[PDB]
Amino acid sequence: GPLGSAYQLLLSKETLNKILQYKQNLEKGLATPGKFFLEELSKQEKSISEMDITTFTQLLIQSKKPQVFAESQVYHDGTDWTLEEESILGDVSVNMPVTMYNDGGHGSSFKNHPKPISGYLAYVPGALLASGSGPTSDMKEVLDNGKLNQDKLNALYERRLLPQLIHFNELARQNEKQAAITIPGIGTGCFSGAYYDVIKPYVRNALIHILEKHKDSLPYIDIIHYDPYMGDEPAEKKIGHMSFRVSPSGVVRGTTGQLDYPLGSNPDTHILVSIVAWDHFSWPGNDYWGGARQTDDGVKAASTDTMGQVTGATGVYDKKWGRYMPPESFTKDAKGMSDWGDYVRENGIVFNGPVLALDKSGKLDTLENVASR
Ligand SMILES: Nc1ncnc2c1ncn2[C@@H]1O[C@H](COP(=O)(O)OP(=O)(O)OC[C@H]2O[C@H](O)[C@H](O)[C@@H]2O)[C@@H](O)[C@H]1O
Ligand code: NA
């Protein structure tokens, strides 16, 4: 079979149901794919009905582009993606082991790790409440006549984050360690739209609700370091056995960065995981495919070997600028037209890896297996 993939795509049981309904609607001629999904379908040979659910899902995920800003560059009307596709893509997360080269500070605030540290990233798209065009799938889902609904937002983040929490619980267990997870203010910046001034407490409440509800499934998760940067009160509380900390590093001096061990954890006792505020439509690291070390997604990708994990190439970390650069051979000359998205174009890289679903018993399994049982 294929070579091992450094990255793994996960999704919830409810997202699998949406995928099955979509696949069946296409098979019956009730749905039209978006043009980008159609483009990826046309590069393989199978009809929708002949391909299986995992291949079908992979091809939809493959329609993502290296850099695309959901808040401003998407129409939601089939000329790019449809709302039915967007509902699915927003639920898909991706994890990968990484080397972390700095603590994740934005701009020039980053602090280099003397020795690069090992851990993991889990890219998860936030609730998309911004658009340069019409309303989004997430807006339809979590707003009632324009008002945010906490219970509906809770269910959305539950769908999106629980598969990764379950994954890293099991990974901590099999590594005979506990998990420390750093989390940013997902959805509270570029994705917040008109809700910028009110969204922050909703996200913190959603995280607390998911951890309270599922604590029995997360015995190897130990520390949750939630850093909304600004706009939430510093706090520490116990959620069952788990230490949940609200540590906004934009207002409090001397907080640990997203790509660093929170207080109480170290490499011998914990695996280190950071959630990344991702994008429905882009590859992990979005902005930084275009050379921009900007936003949680672009900063964390640039500050790790994310792009090496996705492309398979060996990049070179630049200490002065806090960013993992393309291979020296690619950068040497090239007219400076040599960022990672340029690398993708000339080497025909695609984003496509293994995908698993979280079944109703709390086990990650193949789409085929979950759908049948
Ligand atoms: N200087 C800073 N240092 C640290 N955190 C900061 C800083 N400035 C803002 N934050 C916090 O960073 C947190 C994350 O805000 P965002 O990165 O916009 O994420 P989203 O989920 O809303 O938008 C996702 C889109 O943005 C990307 O392009 C993706 O690819 C998507 O296209 C917030 O708490 C900020 O307050
Ligand atoms: Na609740």
Author numbering: 37 to 409
The article reads:
ADP-ribosylation is a reversible post-translational modification involved in various cellular activities. Removal of ADP-ribosylation requires (ADP-ribosyl)hydrolases, with macrodomain enzymes being a major family in this category. Further analyses reveal DUF4804 as a class of MavL-like macrodomain enzymes whose representative members show unique selectivity for mono-ADP-ribosylated arginine residue in synthetic substrates. Crystal structures of several proteins in this class provide insights into arginine specificity and a shared mode of ADP-ribose interaction distinct from previously characterized macrodomains.
Thus, it appears that the arginine insertion contributes to packing interactions outcompeting ADPR binding. Mutation of R370 to alanine, while retaining normal (ADP-ribosyl)hydrolase activity, led to successful capture of ADPR-bound MavL, with well-defined electron density guiding unambiguous placement of the ligand. H142 and Y265 interact with the adenosine via π-π stacking, yet a commonly present aspartate in other macrodomains stabilizing the N6 atom of adenosine is absent in MavL. Furthermore, the proximal ribose is held by interactions with the backbone of G221 and P264 and the side chains of T224 and K236. The di-phosphate mainly interacts with the backbone atoms of the loop containing residues from G223 to F227 (referred to here as the di-phosphate binding loop, loop 1): specifically, the α-phosphate with C226 and D332 and the β-phosphate with G223, G225, and F227. Another loop from D315 to D323 (referred to here as the catalytic loop, loop 2) is responsible for the distal ribose binding in MavL, with D315, N322, and D323 directly forming hydrogen bonds with hydroxyl groups on the C3”, C2” and C3”, and C1” atoms, respectively. In addition, D333 forms hydrogen bonds to the hydroxyl group on the C2” atom. Mutations of D315, D323, D333, or F227, to alanine resulted in a significant loss of activities of MavL, whereas N322A and T331A mutants only exhibited activity loss with low enzymatic concentrations. From the same structure, we observed five ordered waters around the distal ribose, three of them (w1, w2, and w3) above and two (w4 and w5) below the ribose ring. On the other hand, the substrate-associated w4 is bound to the phosphate groups of the ADPR and further stabilized by the backbone of A313 and D333, and the side chain of T331. This water is the closest to C1” atom (with a distance of 3.3 Å); accordingly, we propose it to be the catalytic water and its possible activation by the α-phosphate of ADPR for nucleophilic attack at the C1” center following an SN2 mechanism.
